[PDB]
Amino acid sequence: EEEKNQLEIERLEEQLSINVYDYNCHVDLIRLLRLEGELTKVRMARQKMSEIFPLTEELWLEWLHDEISMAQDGLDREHVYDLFEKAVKDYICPNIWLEYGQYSVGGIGQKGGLEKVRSVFERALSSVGLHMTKGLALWEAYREFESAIVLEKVHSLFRRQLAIPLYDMEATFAEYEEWSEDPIPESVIQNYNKALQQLEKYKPYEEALLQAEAPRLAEYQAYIDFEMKIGDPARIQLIFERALVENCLVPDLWIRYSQYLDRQKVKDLVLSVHNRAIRNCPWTVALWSRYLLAMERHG
């Protein structure tokens, strides 16, 4: 069935030359070639797809996994890091960050390898460390890394985490008590209580998301309203980003994120968000207008 396959490879290719904006054709084309072992054409197809489209976490991770295995030396490794840097730009991506962290720990023996690992985890925590269901895996991964080389930094990460509302933060408090020789300070006990209060406050909104059907737009918009009432810029940014993972083809959501950012010392953030907006909703003239106004405003 090689001739059968090659025929449908050529058909999909012709269909892409007819219309490059056919997402499923790209995916179908790439799926074949990975099985067929045409490693060169798979990489080229992935490169071309990723120029045209923002990719989901799953699509990125399939690519990254193949490239990790094929990387043999320090230079190949750097090109894999370049691929991670491209990968993390599209949407918030806790699993890509976890894999970036693990790959970096794999390269610990590179010169500067320790700094690279800590940079990766700190950057991950900056993006997803407040994520109520998915942030905890990154705090735990970072603590397991820091433990495996000591141990004040592990105290730091327990205490930093416990100031933040996350699911299973009760278990982390118990863990920290049992782990710590000394007892936990009062300030950290006080912030933990404040964080538990926050957690309870957010629980109805999280439950609404989990209960509602995908892509749960109304439940996201209500959560966004709620966080915008509360006013923490990091939290507002996070909820927009969570909503956009599932609602990336909704121009109104990007526009709302853009309006919020028009009221902010954050040039790099503003311009990266607008680029992502036009990659996801390229037919929306208002988003292109907004992107160019933002560039002028920040020039």
- Contact call for residues 9 and 26 (beta carbons, < 8 A): no
Lookup result for tokens 């060169």: 40
Q: Whose Cβ is closer to Cl ion: residue 122's or residue 144's?
A: 122
Interaction between residue 119 and Cl ion (CB under 5 A): yes
CA quadruple 14, 18, 20, 26: dihedral sign: negative
Q: Whose Cβ is closer to Cl ion: residue 100's or residue 158's?
A: 100
**75-102 exposure pattern, b = at least 16 Cβ within 10 A, e = fewer:** eebeebbebbeebbebbbbbebbbbbbe
DSSP label of 167:
T
Q: Whose Cβ is closer to Cl ion: residue 119's or residue 156's?
A: 119
Q: Whose Cβ is closer to Cl ion: residue 54's or residue 113's?
A: 113
Interaction between residue 126 and Cl ion (CB under 5 A): no
Q: Whose Cβ is closer to Cl ion: residue 119's or residue 147's?
A: 119
Residues shown for the chain: 299
- Contact call for residues 128 and 100 (beta carbons, < 8 A): no
Q: Whose Cβ is closer to Cl ion: residue 107's or residue 215's?
A: 107
Interaction between residue 197 and Cl ion (CB under 5 A): no
Q: How far is the CB of 62 from Cl ion (least distance, A)?
A: 22
Q: How far is the CB of 64 from Cl ion (least distance, A)?
A: 15
Closest CA to 120 of 96, 156, 152, 92: 96
Contacts of 208 (CB under 8 A, 6+ apart): 216, 219, 222, 223
**Binding span for Cl ion by CB under 5 A among 10-18, 85-93, 115-123, 186-194:** 115-123
**Binding span for Cl ion by CB under 5 A among 117-125, 137-145, 184-192, 222-230:** 117-125
Cis peptide before 185 (omega within 30 of 0): no
Q: How far is the CB of 112 from Cl ion (least distance, A)?
A: 10
Q: Whose Cβ is closer to Cl ion: residue 88's or residue 136's?
A: 88
Question: What's the maximum distance between 2 C-alpha atoms anywhere in the chain?
Answer: 72
Q: How far is the CB of 242 from Cl ion (least distance, A)?
A: 23
User: How many whole angstroms separate alpha carbon 180 and alpha carbon 162?
Assistant: 14
Q: How far is the CB of 115 from Cl ion (least distance, A)?
A: 8
Question: Which H or E run contains 43?
Answer: helix 39-52
User: How many whole angstroms separate alpha carbon 84 and alpha carbon 50?
Assistant: 13
**Binding span for Cl ion by CB under 5 A among 5-13, 37-45, 55-63, 114-122:** 114-122
User: How many whole angstroms separate alpha carbon 54 and alpha carbon 279?
Assistant: 7
Q: How far is the CB of 120 from Cl ion (least distance, A)?
A: 5
Chain position whose Cβ is nearest to Cl ion = 119
Judged by CB under 5 A, the number of residues near Cl ion is 1
Q: Whose Cβ is closer to Cl ion: residue 53's or residue 81's?
A: 81
Q: How far is the CB of 205 from Cl ion (least distance, A)?
A: 32
**Binding span for Cl ion by CB under 5 A among 14-22, 27-35, 113-121, 228-236:** 113-121
Give contact residues for Cl ion (rule: CB under 5 A).
119
